[PDB]
């Protein structure tokens, strides 16, 4: 079992309205909708992890910052990040992460 | 023949005794290798740590301190209250000095 | 209950 | 915050129940009726418990 | 007399509160708020206005650090007990105390550390493998003082303006007949 | 991004991929897998991010990450820390990394 | 006598123990703990330096035993031998024979292990190579 | 390091961490306590004067071991004695460790005595930076005439244009 | 593990100068004598 913060992502709320609809369609029950998340959850996180070569990184100005409950959660503005070159600026962006020692 | 170190005396020693060379091997280093392992843990409620202790009592009757800790990952005066809250220790069996479930709980 | 350390000559 | 902290008090086996029952009946300084106690608890029903206590 | 004084550069405080807290509940709902469990038994808070740091604990003991002046000090336990007002919590000012105060100041002679040390070696101890910083201990009052040889002298372990004051200017000679080149 | 779009591809392959004996436990139908597949690209198309081949406390379009954390330094004034293996959008535009070190200053 | 006793005694001594293991088992209160640990510790070749002092202050120089005559000194001179450390592990699982592996950490370092003093004239001596004019600058007697 | 420091025959830290395995900052505040409890008997008994005993520098007992440790001929080493005890009349160096003021001198000296010794040996030998061996050279590159002892360059034995240029 | 308290070489030190400054021989005597430098042949 991992951590259950990939719910955020925009495949983990693509997934979980699904579940949502197919909860409203009754085909697949609520048992069943959590662990297709978390073994998703699971599959995601190791599929990132194994076979991606880029890189990142980000210069910025935080504004608010908190780590309550083994997770960090981070606010920064007027942030600058690079792919992999060219640099474009983010108004607001908040980070989300949590402790690499695995859960469970 | 042996063999005679033809250097000047203190060359060689330079690496004797009271010195600053510092020891760089990892021989023998048993006791910067096992103080890097850190116990710590909170007041998780009263409840779950009491519920976890059933499990493990009714998984095996019989456990020790340490074993009990290592099972569990909580501070030794909380776990020692909730085992002499509901459980106790053999003093004289053969099973001496391992908690074990009281007789009033042996039943459940 | 083990003698921990041993001499193997 | 501090109620949803808390877990349910309707414990998976008796034993917890009948030892937060025993904890209640200590703590007061009186003799409590049956009523009050299994308001302690969860649940109001008929059980092992109360046959367990007497 | 003495050509400058010393400022006061951090300061600090005690409250209690009189209650009980919920660390927990602090944390989530506080946004400058870093609790690590399994690392420190409390909850840290900090705040920009005063930029002093707050030491939150699940006893309703309060520890004000990173305050330049009283006044900082006062305002920044009134926005903590604000705080801890807005945030669920009933907290009073029972008790507030300044246990700390210290401060940098400067004379801009280089000072022999070797001859203090040797003359003033009963309220003093140099160890310069260590820290390169003289230490000294004077008896009255209790005032510990950091010594450089670029005239940087950090007075530490006040509680109000006097004592501070008074043991710069007592110290103040006794550094000054010091000189090099 | 081309390799978001690939890493993408590959993750909604091996998510319909490796939970489908799972969804036959369940006895439903076959079509199971090619709707779900069908409405995951539909909203991955409607979302039109990445291209598919197929006065003080804490009170979609928003630009949100998700990564993992190894080890966070923290000064006076920088906040360095050692994001790994997560994924960030930038203005609408995903992205993937190995590493990623923010440098943010206190105010 | 001297001569052989340096030249070769000492080697032979040294070669006779020197090896020593020192043999840390299971430990096997938990099944996690199913490691068994081989320490050995080797001599090698011995050294023998030239006759030396170190002083109070830790300074080393050559000694002569002229000034270790006047200075009520002892003419000795430093032995060093090569030590070399093996550490071997093994994961004992009862009902079968232990196997001990190299970890791999084999640190090696010469370290010093006594004086031995040293007969006059001998061929870690100084007088030995020295001509009579030598001896005399020496202020030794030929 | 009482013992040694007591009988002017005193070491530094790093020879007391070679041999025992403690950890600086108890080993600091023990030799505090240690300093203060050994001076209040004295106060209480027969009083002594320090006369620099448990003197902060005492690089002079700190260059003949070094110098030994470095194979050095004494002339190297009374020429970095003189060095060393002209170093506290320079205000830039005087807040550096005399570990350091006496590595500095020696190799300052070494190169003066075109001693064929790089600064990376004296750096594995002494365990001291050759990042911070280089900066007190650095350092030390302006004080030519300060440091170097007068009679040396009378005898013509050395001479300033030796120092390798920075 | 410190190899610098692991060998004692004051034992082996201290051994080599008892055993010959006194002639007590071990942990028989007088087998280490002061020379007689009275005359040469002496």
New interface residues.
Partial sequence: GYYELYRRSTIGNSLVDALDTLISDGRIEASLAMRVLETFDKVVAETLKDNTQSKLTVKGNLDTYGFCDDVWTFIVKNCQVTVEQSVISVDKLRIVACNSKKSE | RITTLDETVGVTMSHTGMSMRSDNSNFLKVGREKAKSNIKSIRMPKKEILDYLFKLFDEYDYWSLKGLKERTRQPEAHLKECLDKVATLVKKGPYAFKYTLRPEYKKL | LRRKTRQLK | ??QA???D?S??????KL??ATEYIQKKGKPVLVNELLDYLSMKKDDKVIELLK | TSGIVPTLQNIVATVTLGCRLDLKTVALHARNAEYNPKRFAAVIMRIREPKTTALIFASGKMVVTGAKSEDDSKLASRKYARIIQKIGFAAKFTDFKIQNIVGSCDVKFPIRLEGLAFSHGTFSSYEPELFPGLIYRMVKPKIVLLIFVSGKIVLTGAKQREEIYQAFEAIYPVLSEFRKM | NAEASRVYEIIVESVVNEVREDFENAGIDEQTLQDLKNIWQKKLTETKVTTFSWDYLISPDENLMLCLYDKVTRTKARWKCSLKDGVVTINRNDYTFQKAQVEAEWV | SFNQFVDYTLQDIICEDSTLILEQLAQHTTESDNISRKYEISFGKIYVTKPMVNESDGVTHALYPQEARLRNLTYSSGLFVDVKKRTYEAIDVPGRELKYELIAEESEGKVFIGRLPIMLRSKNCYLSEATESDLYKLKECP | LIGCRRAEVARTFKEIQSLIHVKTKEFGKTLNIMKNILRGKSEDGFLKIDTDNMSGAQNLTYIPRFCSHLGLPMQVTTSAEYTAKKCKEIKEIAGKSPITIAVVSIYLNILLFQIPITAAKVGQTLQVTEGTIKSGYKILYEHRDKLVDPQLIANGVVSLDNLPGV | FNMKLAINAKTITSGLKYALATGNWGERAGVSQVLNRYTYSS
């Fill in positions: 915050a501090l902290n808390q877990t008090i414990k998976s086996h008796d034993s917890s030892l937060w």
